[PDB]
Amino acid sequence: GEHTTCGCGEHCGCNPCACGREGTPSGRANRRANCSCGAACNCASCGSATAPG
Ligand SMILES: [Zn+2]
Ligand SMILES: [Zn+2]
Ligand SMILES: [Zn+2]
Ligand SMILES: [Zn+2]
């Protein structure tokens, strides 16, 4: 059915899957350059956008 997806309900690098897709990573903020997400993302692995980690 589904795939490993960010809990916000969207493929993101923070959820590796057999397809490893994360969507177009908007390089417009301090994210892993693999976080395409935007909308309602309570995933801790995506909130992380502070300090070099
Ligand atoms: Zn996938
Ligand atoms: Zn994300
Ligand atoms: Zn997300
Ligand atoms: Zn996430």
Curated annotation (Swiss-Prot):
Induction note: By abscisic acid (ABA).
GO MF terms held by the record: zinc ion binding
Keyword Metal-binding: yes
Keywords: Metal-binding, Metal-thiolate cluster, Zinc
Sequence similarity: Belongs to the metallothionein superfamily. Type 15 family.
Function: Binds 5 molecules of zinc. May have a role in Zn(2+) homeostasis during embryogenesis.
This protein's name: EC protein I/II
Included range, full protein: 31 to 81 of 81
